[PDB]
Amino acid sequence: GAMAPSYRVKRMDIAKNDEECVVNAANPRGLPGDGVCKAVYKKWPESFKNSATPVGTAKTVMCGTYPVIHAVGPNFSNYTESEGDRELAAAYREVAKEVTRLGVNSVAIPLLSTGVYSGGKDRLTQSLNHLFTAMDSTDADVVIYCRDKEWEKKISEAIQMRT
Ligand SMILES: CCOc1ncccc1C(=O)N(C)C
Ligand SMILES: [Cl-]
Ligand SMILES: [Cl-]
């Protein structure tokens, strides 16, 4: 565990993280994909061997000794708001199980279902609150990665509000 488990946010490419493992915002088919998934494919392509897994689940594959946790959030273009909310919560619960099982002291995590799976809706708060619900009982240092300057501010505010 970390000595004083924390949440932090950084605005940069998650493929350049300084943590002991990474969460990929994966597709269910283990394809290279776009956005975070394509950056993860370029950095850790070995981790996409048998990485296909259903919506609402996470599957870990090692790149050398570095763990890549493939977490499959729902595409809100296809799911109802109700069913999508349930699957997005479940994907983060499976990430917390994997982080715990691996025994890492830190994890880099993107906000699932906030990009091309958002159905064009702002889901910062929805996705971040499911992240907190899952990860609050873990003792890893969590570092959230984003690309937008206004999102960095809003994620940082949400973290500081609870401290
Ligand atoms: C910066 C705002 O971003 C978005 N807003 C609404 C829907 C999707 C996005 C997006 O593609 N993100 C990568 C988060
Ligand atoms: Cl960068
Ligand atoms: Cl997405």
Ligand SMILES: [Cl-]
């Ligand atoms: Cl972002």
